[PDB]
Amino acid sequence: INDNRYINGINQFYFSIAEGRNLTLGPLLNMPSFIPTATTPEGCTRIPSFSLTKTHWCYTHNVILNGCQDHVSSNQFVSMGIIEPTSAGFPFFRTLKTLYLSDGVNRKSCSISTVPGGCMMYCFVSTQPERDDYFSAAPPEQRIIIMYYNDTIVERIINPPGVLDVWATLNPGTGSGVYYLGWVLFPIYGGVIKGTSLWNNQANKYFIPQMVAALCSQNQATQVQNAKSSYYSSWFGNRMIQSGILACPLRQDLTNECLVLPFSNDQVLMGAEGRLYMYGDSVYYYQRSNSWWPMTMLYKVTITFTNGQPSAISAQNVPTQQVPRPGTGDCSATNRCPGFCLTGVYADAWLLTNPSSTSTFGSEATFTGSYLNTATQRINPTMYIANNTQIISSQQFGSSGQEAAYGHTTCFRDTGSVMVYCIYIIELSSSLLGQFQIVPFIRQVTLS
Amino acid sequence: INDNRYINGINQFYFSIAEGRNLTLGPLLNMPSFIPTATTPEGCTRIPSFSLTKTHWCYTHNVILNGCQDHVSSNQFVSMGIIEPTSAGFPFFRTLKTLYLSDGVNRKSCSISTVPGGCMMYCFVSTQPERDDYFSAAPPEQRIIIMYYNDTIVERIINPPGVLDVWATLNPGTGSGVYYLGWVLFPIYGGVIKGTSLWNNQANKYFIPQMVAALCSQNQATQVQNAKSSYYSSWFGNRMIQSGILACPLRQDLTNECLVLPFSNDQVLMGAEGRLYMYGDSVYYYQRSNSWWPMTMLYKVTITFTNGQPSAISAQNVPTQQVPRPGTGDCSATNRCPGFCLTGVYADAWLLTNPSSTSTFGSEATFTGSYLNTATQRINPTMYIANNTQIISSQQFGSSGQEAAYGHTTCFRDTGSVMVYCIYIIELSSSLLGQFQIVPFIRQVTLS
Amino acid sequence: INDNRYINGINQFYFSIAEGRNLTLGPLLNMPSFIPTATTPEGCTRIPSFSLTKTHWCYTHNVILNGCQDHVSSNQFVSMGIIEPTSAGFPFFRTLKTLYLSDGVNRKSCSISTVPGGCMMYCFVSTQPERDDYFSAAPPEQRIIIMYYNDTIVERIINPPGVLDVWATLNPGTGSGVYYLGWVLFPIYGGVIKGTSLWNNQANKYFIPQMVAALCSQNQATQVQNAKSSYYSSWFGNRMIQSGILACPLRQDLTNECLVLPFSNDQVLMGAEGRLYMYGDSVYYYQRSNSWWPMTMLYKVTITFTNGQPSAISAQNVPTQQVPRPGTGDCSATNRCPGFCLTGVYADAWLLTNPSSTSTFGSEATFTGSYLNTATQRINPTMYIANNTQIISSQQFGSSGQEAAYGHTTCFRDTGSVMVYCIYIIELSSSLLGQFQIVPFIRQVTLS
Amino acid sequence: INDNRYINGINQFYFSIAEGRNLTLGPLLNMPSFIPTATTPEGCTRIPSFSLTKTHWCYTHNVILNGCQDHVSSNQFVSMGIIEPTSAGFPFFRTLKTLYLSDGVNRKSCSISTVPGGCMMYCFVSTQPERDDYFSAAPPEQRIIIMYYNDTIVERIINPPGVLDVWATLNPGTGSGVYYLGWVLFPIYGGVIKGTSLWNNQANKYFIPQMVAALCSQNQATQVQNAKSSYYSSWFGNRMIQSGILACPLRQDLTNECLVLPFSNDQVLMGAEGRLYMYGDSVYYYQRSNSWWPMTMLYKVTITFTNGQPSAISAQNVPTQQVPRPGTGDCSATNRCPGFCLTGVYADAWLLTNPSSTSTFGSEATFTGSYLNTATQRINPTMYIANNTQIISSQQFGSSGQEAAYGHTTCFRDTGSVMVYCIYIIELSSSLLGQFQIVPFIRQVTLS
Numbered sequence A, B, C, D: 001i002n003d004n005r006y007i008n009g010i011n012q013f014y015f016s017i018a019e020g021r022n023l024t025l026g027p028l029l030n031m032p033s034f035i036p037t038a039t040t041p042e043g044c045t046r047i048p049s050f051s052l053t054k055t056h057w058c059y060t061h062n063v064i065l066n067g068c069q070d071h072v073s074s075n076q077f078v079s080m081g082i083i084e085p086t087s088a089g090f091p092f093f094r095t096l097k098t099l100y101l102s103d104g105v106n107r108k109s110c111s112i113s114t115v116p117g118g119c120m121m122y123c124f125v126s127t128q129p130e131r132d133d134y135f136s137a138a139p140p141e142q143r144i145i146i147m148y149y150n151d152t153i154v155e156r157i158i159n160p161p162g163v164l165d166v167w168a169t170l171n172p173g174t175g176s177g178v179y180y181l182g183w184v185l186f187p188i189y190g191g192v193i194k195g196t197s198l199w200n201n202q203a204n205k206y207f208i209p210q211m212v213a214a215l216c217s218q219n220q221a222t223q224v225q226n227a228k229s230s231y232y233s234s235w236f237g238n239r240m241i242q243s244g245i246l247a248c249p250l251r252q253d254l255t256n257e258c259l260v261l262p263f264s265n266d267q268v269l270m271g272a273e274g275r276l277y278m279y280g281d282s283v284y285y286y287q288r289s290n291s292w293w294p295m296t297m298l299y300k301v302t303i304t305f306t307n308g309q310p311s312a313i314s315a316q317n318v319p320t321q322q323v324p325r326p327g328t329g330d331c332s333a334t335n336r337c338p339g340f341c342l343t344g345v346y347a348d349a350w351l352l353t354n355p356s357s358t359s360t361f362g363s364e365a366t367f368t369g370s371y372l373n374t375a376t377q378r379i380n381p382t383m384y385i386a387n388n389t390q391i392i393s394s395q396q397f398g399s400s401g402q403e404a405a406y407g408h409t410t411c412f413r414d415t416g417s418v419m420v421y422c423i424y425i426i427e428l429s430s431s432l433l434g435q436f437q438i439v440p441f442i443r444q445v446t447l448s
């Protein structure tokens, strides 16, 4: 279990609104990396997922032997452990168990979550290029693997209701899932088939971030028209790209008990990868900006239970215009107008302040993470701290031109020294070993 | 415990003399690295030690937060696990436990060894520059830490007899130790004080490798004179630089039961770092070439027991003129004449063939490892396979100029597929994260 | 069920057009044969049928106690199991159930197919020499046996419509059938009676392979005339030798629900033995060359359903001039001109590349299998890989003169190691035990 | 379970003394072989073990990929099933489960035995040439694997008392073991160390078959002297070559509960491979003639229990001078005089008549099996029926010169047709597939 210094400083809003204004990033600290490196120049390690809870943490990433493209073979590395203080005062992520799922099943886009006594991981089995998944009416095989600290492993092929003949494809968001009221929730996304109930119930719905008006040159009527069209992709089999949550009861004999809960397209942007968080008793969702709006998307999620089962989810966006992501064409970091984009990168963010602490939800919110500081290239990885409109602290890593990709950020507090540490898991392009080197950067978020 | 595919292919001579002539190195294979990376540009990870036995493996290395120099603080990372096959057929070193000794004790030059149920590590506590250790008549504190797989940890300060007032300094060789007949043996080296019994019993002794004559331009009398002087260092407090073995009985209450067994200087070169191996029931020793002879030094060690206690060791050298190491001045890779050098690098080698299988010990021996292919710079890391006089297979890693340091090589056979794999743990200079990135390269040694 | 290493590498085109050009056959690998041997010098085991699907495989062959000729007694051996990896990396066909249909019913020319939970086998009951079957206006009794993995066995005598008074004889093609959209499809062939609707609707129809013109010395008008006559056999009761497909709904009370679907003689050659395959969602058919064209015949089959029932089939030939088969007289492997032949051997082929991946269907197709390399004798069994015009890789088995007969080839990929294996089931003439020894040769199809 | 036609005709003496005089071998019958064949010319399948009991049968053999020599890798094929009648009246060994132990553990000289609900197999792990096993004072690892029909598999490393420091080596006899009064008994053999209690208690003991006197030209005193020396092998590490029985209680957590019971050297010849049988409630033992006496050795074994545990075994030889085996030098099939031989072949025999039915034990005994009819070569496999002094029925298989090796014979009666069938499992040298083809020949033993 995690050291006494951290058990009470996990999954919480660490600073008050007033303190958020005076936060800065401290130097990067050196700790032994718990994320394994490739041992060949061409080896590819990508798509990390990290879950940290009161008792322990779970980590995983995909491994492809040659290059970063394969719709046939790949392995998935899983790791779990605890956090303990070093003589210098900062954290050391102590790995207590390692697993390497290597058996011919092409498990991809995996999301992992901490569960009592272990980790629960959700993946889909890839057997063809992603685009092909959207055209085929049949969805890929879905799997949830439970790995207990006592080395017992139980993998199940799941068939949640409302998936077959509704979703042409379904993928975990790769971002961490969360254990909530006895259920494990994972972010999901995919393409819905035209004519289905879901498609019809979503017809004419759209979402436009609160701060777009002041930045978009198009009029309200034009924005609305373009936003509605941003949820449909002709390139991806003419499917409605949908975001949602997969709720699975913690059982070892899962079959069709997991529930697919899609977000209303009136509250969320075009479906994309994502991540779920827990701040106190509140669930939050991060949605990758793979559509027209290039800014960080965070939402407070309200989950409704009907007869002990999740029945519906509602999302309230934290309005911001900060931390853009690189995109292609008319969907770069400089875009502000609705339309149809299918480009971007995964770059989640951690809320250091409570959005509900202000009279108007999210009026003054502070968050931290990493982002690729450029308009269209996946370059210049930069760790930051920002509020709704400005970056109040940042530090680029490496020299300009340094390639990078996804960035998963997680923060926790040392209740002993009373300092907050954040880990920024970034996929860095390396010139020595492997295509990428996933690095768990760690530093303090200083108040002052 | 290790998979059934490896339990019977560990610590053995894998090939016959005839087969050794047709061995070649296969491509590097990609597996998840079990050696942790630094998370800052200046973080320093160095001095690895690796022990692999029938049941499991032990790994460790030193971590310094800023740069690679400190005689005050540093931490020591320890790891242990097993080997299991991947769907591609090659090994995956599965970490089952991690430890980070971080408490203010500056444990350095640590050597680790597998023991039933865990790992035994031997370190010395550094409190001043190395050179200062040789001048002070008092030796550094010595410690042996036993770490059981059941998480029990027992550290002891040891005071073996014949150390105080004999050795001005004493260090573990950093190379792996071995569990032999109930005792854990570790390679050691240091400086002996003038006038001591050890010094006197070693007076006028010297060792000259069998293949030096044909390569040295000096006459026999001159070589003998210079060789005798190569065991004394005026730069290192005028001490006799000695190599040896530390034998510790496997106990949890060690105090003065470990025994310091020095090698006769008539059979070994000037003391240096080293490593111990087990090939069947035979113990072997690798001695870093930190003196005048720049070639790989391997010896078969014969241990004598008197009343259940190791009482003396004898070493028989495997005569070679292959695989040189970079050195400074008149002690570079091109040197062949006796004299006093105090320069070189650690680069052990694994014997793929049995030296005793030939009528004349070591007449035709084959070994593998890595070496820095250059005369004086620690550059061009190159993995190879060689016999007594030639390199019969090699492959440089990275582009010329690539900096590197130590190299620990270990081989084992998959008794299922019947192929031999070797792991080459090399300290590589990295430009992205940390001063060095210790990489566990792995590839096959192909027969044909 | 099959190991995770194979469940996703079955019934697919494994290579791209570009990769097909660089394919070669690896050494034969040794695995325990799952095909039973005879225990007497005269015992005869022949006519194998093999079906491999995602979950498991089904195998069967005919057993005659004395010699290879009997129109009265014979037994049929059935076997089923899964595929799992060996420590050497290659497959082991693990038999999980064996059955020996020995009860006096002379079941012949059986074709077998995998079905959910078991195997479905289709045979006809022989009671007289084959030639006699064509002269008698009454067709032989037809039977389909379902054998579930739970040991339940259900055999039914079927009477599909349009058989009585239309087909003088009807036989399964012996090649595997396939489970498609809830129906089990089997290849069939036989002789149709003059004056029947089928006969009339087939009148004046003929098929000439695309690559015959350039190789045949006869003019177009003469070729057309001879091709039309190749579908009628005076030796076989003056019947129209027809090829087709038998579609049976997966039920345990089959009576007259199976449907006989003949191929149009404008798209297929004279009826003969055959086999059905599944490549993704596409059905393919292999037609033994028992007529004038001695080259491998493969067709993509398009099945039309009318009210949930197969109503018609269409075949598109993959144009080739490669891999001939031994024949008698003016119908040997060297023949190229239309006429009436009734000679040849069964030698199916597996498509390693997708014929539809080229702008012009089958313009560049690659396939593998075995063939008897000789003009008129059933001799020199040779495994190969070939494209439309040339054999790009081959290896004869045994010494010249080695007798053999049928060859059933099936390939699948290990999604773990990412290699393709093909099994070549060949009837080999043996000098020790039995007339023939049906051997499941297995080797890899290497890319490079 | 076995068909009703065989459940009551297993493990019994089938004929009376009077009927034994009129027994003859019927033609070989053709049934589908349940023993798997190799699929490469060099593949090697050898060392079969077969156990047949009231409910079912167990079968196993060793598989080496290249040639028949390896002290590192090999796999072990296991099979189990039942017996059922065919329409022709004779047996069909129906395989209901197959297993292929392929994981890097070099399991050799395995003996298998039927147990309620499955099979228990006993093997030793080879890691060096056989001769080396006798010189090393440490015995090879011993393992017993239980394989239940419900697919549960439990393998255990056993350490029976009195093995370490007593037996330099220990091997299962490869012949079948038997389930007796809740214990599984396996034949064993190996080399005992000089000076051990076993060695001392065996000192000066020897056994000379009752019918040697009349055939040996040496006098009684000389025979006795030479016989005593035949139990010690200087070629095999100067060990006393011992035969015995390993008794294991049927448990799934075996550790040190199995008991090593050596035969008194006053009742048995030099240790060798062997087999255990059950005839009614009596245990019998077959001992390979690897010493000076080249004739078939069968003994009735009396087992003594002390506190529910086997405590001692006694053997009574069935005196014969029939069915010799090929041997080397002065130990060929023509030898009759005591001395030290270490040559021969495994060729067990089944007793068709009860040796205890005669006033003088074994005065008139009849048995059947196969033997290599030649003086020194492993050639001319011949199935027979013989009494103490003559072969009363025989039939060679193949043409003279045909190579073969071991032969395991098992007989049982069809209580329906009232006929006895015997299966002769013979390792035949094949020219087509594999080094050997282990064939389960089957025929009737006719009374008349």
Ligand SMILES: CC(=O)N[C@H]1[C@H]([C@H](O)[C@H](O)CO)O[C@@](O[C@H]2[C@@H](O)[C@@H](CO)O[C@@H](O[C@H]3[C@H](O)[C@@H](O)[C@@H](O)O[C@@H]3CO)[C@@H]2O)(C(=O)O)C[C@@H]1O
Pocket: A047, A109, A130, A171, A272, A273, A290, A342, A343, A344, A345, A346, A405
């Ligand atoms: C299931 C899957 O493939 N997931 C990948 C995701 C998804 O593509 C994303 O969530 C949208 O569905 O994203 C990642 O893959 C992208 C990456 O390989 C980049 C590299 O340039 O290319 C993207 O594809 C572009 C393509 O390059 C364009 O030419 C055009 O075809 O549009 C596509 C849009 O997808 C990949 O999607 C990612 O790195 O962000 C990784 C996940 O494996």
Ligand SMILES: CC(=O)N[C@H]1[C@H]([C@H](O)[C@H](O)CO)O[C@@](O[C@H]2[C@@H](O)[C@@H](CO)O[C@@H](O[C@H]3[C@H](O)[C@@H](O)[C@@H](O)O[C@@H]3CO)[C@@H]2O)(C(=O)O)C[C@@H]1O
Pocket: B047, B109, B130, B171, B272, B273, B290, B342, B343, B344, B345, B346, B405
């Ligand atoms: C206890 C200890 O310091 N161990 C280090 C060893 C020992 O120095 C070696 O076994 C000989 O006693 O070696 C390592 O350290 C050397 C490394 O830092 C190099 C880098 O250039 O410098 C060596 O020192 C040189 C120095 O650079 C010269 O100017 C001159 O003073 O000679 C000294 C000789 O020691 C370090 O010894 C090593 O990397 O090989 C690392 C161990 O920590």
Ligand SMILES: CC(=O)N[C@H]1[C@H]([C@H](O)[C@H](O)CO)O[C@@](O[C@H]2[C@@H](O)[C@@H](CO)O[C@@H](O[C@H]3[C@H](O)[C@@H](O)[C@@H](O)O[C@@H]3CO)[C@@H]2O)(C(=O)O)C[C@@H]1O
Pocket: C047, C109, C130, C171, C272, C273, C290, C342, C343, C344, C345, C346, C405
């Ligand atoms: C139902 C049946 O008999 N099937 C057999 C098939 C069919 O004959 C084939 O699909 C054409 O209808 O083919 C196999 O049998 C042939 C084989 O026994 C060879 C051996 O030489 O002889 C063929 O018959 C020849 C005969 O030898 C000629 O003299 C002349 O009469 O023509 C006939 C043509 O049939 C057998 O057909 C086969 O091995 O290919 C086996 C099937 O059992």
Ligand SMILES: CC(=O)N[C@H]1[C@H]([C@H](O)[C@H](O)CO)O[C@@](O[C@H]2[C@@H](O)[C@@H](CO)O[C@@H](O[C@H]3[C@H](O)[C@@H](O)[C@@H](O)O[C@@H]3CO)[C@@H]2O)(C(=O)O)C[C@@H]1O
Pocket: D047, D109, D130, D171, D272, D273, D290, D342, D343, D344, D345, D346, D405
């Ligand atoms: C554990 C083991 O090796 N078992 C093998 C047994 C034993 O050798 C036998 O029980 C005596 O200990 O026997 C088998 O192996 C023999 C076979 O390979 C023959 C082939 O010629 O050679 C025998 O070795 C001879 C050798 O050829 C001679 O030159 C001289 O060295 O004597 C040895 C005597 O052992 C093998 O033992 C067998 O086939 O009978 C097979 C078992 O694997």
Ligand SMILES: *[C@H]1O[C@H](CO)[C@@H](O)[C@H](O)[C@H]1NC(C)=O
Pocket: A018, A019, A021, A022, A448
């Ligand atoms: C943060 O710093 C500002 C600037 O000096 C100070 O005025 C403010 O009180 C601090 N914020 C709080 C309340 O911690």
Ligand SMILES: *[C@H]1O[C@H](CO)[C@@H](O)[C@H](O)[C@H]1NC(C)=O
Pocket: B018, B019, B021, B022, B448
């Ligand atoms: C290795 O290769 C050589 C060169 O062809 C060959 O002659 C030799 O027999 C091989 N070595 C052995 C004995 O494995």
Ligand SMILES: *[C@H]1O[C@H](CO)[C@@H](O)[C@H](O)[C@H]1NC(C)=O
Pocket: C018, C019, C021, C022, C448
């Ligand atoms: C196959 O080999 C050829 C010959 O070197 C090479 O040029 C080609 O690129 C390879 N085919 C592919 C694309 O895999």
Ligand SMILES: *[C@H]1O[C@H](CO)[C@@H](O)[C@H](O)[C@H]1NC(C)=O
Pocket: D018, D019, D021, D022, D448
């Ligand atoms: C066996 O055959 C002999 C020879 O005819 C006959 O005399 C004898 O009675 C038979 N044996 C018995 C008793 O079955």
Ligand SMILES: [Ca+2]
Pocket: A132, A133, A134, A135, A136, A137, A138, A139, A140, A167, A168, A169
């Ligand atoms: Ca789909």
Ligand SMILES: [Ca+2]
Pocket: B132, B133, B134, B135, B136, B137, B138, B139, B140, B167, B168, B169
């Ligand atoms: Ca000192």
Ligand SMILES: [Ca+2]
Pocket: C132, C133, C134, C135, C136, C137, C138, C139, C140, C167, C168, C169
């Ligand atoms: Ca008919």
Ligand SMILES: [Ca+2]
Pocket: D132, D133, D134, D135, D136, D137, D138, D139, D140, D167, D168, D169
């Ligand atoms: Ca031994």
